[PDB]
């Protein structure tokens, strides 16, 4: 009423990255494959090789399952040095 009201609703948090994760997906399945991630790359203004595209998979696939999920991907955009 005066100070305590509703729950803490900060500005842009991690969840905000959810909007960026979907962008990487084309079929909206929650997981990105080598074929999907390739589309987002080709669409770019530059030219990317197959090797570069694969480098992204291994760089975001910690479980080595074959696809990247919002969980493991979240860390991807949380520093890539
Ligand atoms: Mg996909
Ligand atoms: Mg994975």
């Amino acid at each position: 009423m005066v100070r305590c009201m509703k729950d803490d609703s900060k500005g842009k948090t991690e969840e905000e990255l959810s909007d960026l994760f979907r962008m990487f997906d084309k079929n909206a399945d929650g997981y990105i494959d080598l074929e999907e991630l390739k589309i987002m790359l080709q669409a770019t203004g530059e030219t990317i090789t197959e090797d570069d595209i694969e480098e992204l998979m291994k760089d975001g696939d910690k479980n080595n399952d074959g696809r990247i999920d919002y969980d493991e991907f979240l860390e991807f955009m949380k520093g890539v040095e």
Side-chain angles (χ1 to χ4, degrees), residues 19-80:
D19 199 308
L20 283 145
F21 185 44
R22 186 189 292 161
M23 298 259 251
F24 271 55
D25 254 331
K26 309 272 89 99
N27 61 334
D29 60 319
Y31 305 68
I32 309 157
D33 215 30
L34 275 95
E35 222 190 302
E36 275 132 22
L37 183 68
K38 200 262 219 298
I39 308 144
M40 192 277 301
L41 286 156
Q42 55 180 53
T44 73
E46 44 175 332
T47 161
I48 312 301
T49 322
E50 269 163 86
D51 230 309
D52 271 281
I53 307 152
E54 216 261 316
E55 265 204 286
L56 269 72
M57 256 301 136
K58 189 126 218 292
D59 271 31
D61 214 294
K62 282 70 128 267
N63 50 353
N64 286 297
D65 63 299
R67 297 209 210 162
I68 311 166
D69 63 53
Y70 176 80
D71 317 302
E72 55 180 328
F73 216 129
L74 233 47
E75 287 253 305
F76 214 137
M77 298 263 151
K78 280 180 152 217
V80 218

